[PDB]
UniProtKB/Swiss-Prot annotation:
Residues of the whole record sequence present: 232 to 503 of 505
Domain NR LBD: 8-259
Any GO CC annotation of this UniProt entry: nucleus
Protein name: Peroxisome proliferator-activated receptor gamma
Originating species: Homo sapiens
Connected disease: Defects in PPARG can lead to type 2 insulin-resistant diabetes and hyptertension. PPARG mutations may be associated with colon cancer. Obesity: A condition characterized by an increase of body weight beyond the limitation of skeletal and physical requirements, as the result of excessive accumulation of body fat.
Amino acid sequence: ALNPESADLRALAKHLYDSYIKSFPLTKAKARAILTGKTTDKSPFVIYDMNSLMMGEDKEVAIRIFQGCQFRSVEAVQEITEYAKSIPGFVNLDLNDQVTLLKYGVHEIIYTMLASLMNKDGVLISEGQGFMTREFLKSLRKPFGDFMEPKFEFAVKFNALELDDSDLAIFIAVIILSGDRPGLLNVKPIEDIQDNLLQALELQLKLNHPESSQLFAKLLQKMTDLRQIVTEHVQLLQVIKKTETDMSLHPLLQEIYKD
Ligand SMILES: CC/C=C\C/C=C\C/C=C\C/C=C\C/C=C\C/C=C\CCC(=O)O
């Protein structure tokens, strides 16, 4: 009994999933397959101590690792940015609002997808070839040992929803196209787009998780969690700025944070 109205939403869902697969080299599906011994050819090298770290590379630890994450983030911003362009209506919006939606949405999206590469013990690195334990990270020199812990806590709770890539594709689209962003010139156009995006997600979740009662509301509530993650990460950098005057925060990343 898929009426003609709902039929339009499915088409949107498929389009986004398609652009999602095409913009992100390491999907949750692949991540899970690596993480759960579902292989012998895609198993990762593990880093849990200083020795394994150096035995893993095939300037100091804490700093070297931080610069690393910096490189990746910027790469992610680039991937998320290319995904944005595929969202119907996004490029058609005011150029300025396009920049605002990205600057405010990029990190909320990065933490959402990061969960895909995490389990309670650690996180995949280098496109899945490596796996760095939570303990190792939670032990790095202060205050770097506090950088990852908050994301892990999100991940663990967030992964309980058991969402797959097709679900995520729409969710992250909903995140970007949010009219309540600071400095938006024309909120209306943006809200019209989020409206059917939320309509797409709801059907998507409905059909794909017929048993999960109120999955739509549970997922939307998680959006609060992402926000706090961003908030405290920000003041964390402010500290790193002061304590490490010789460390360089990538310009692209520095531009996103003037908010
Ligand atoms: C361990 C670093 C070395 C290589 C990186 C390879 C893959 C990266 C994947 C996971 C690494 C762990 C965290 C990085 C993920 C997101 C960035 C973390 C915080 C955001 C920092 C920011 O953008 O300000």
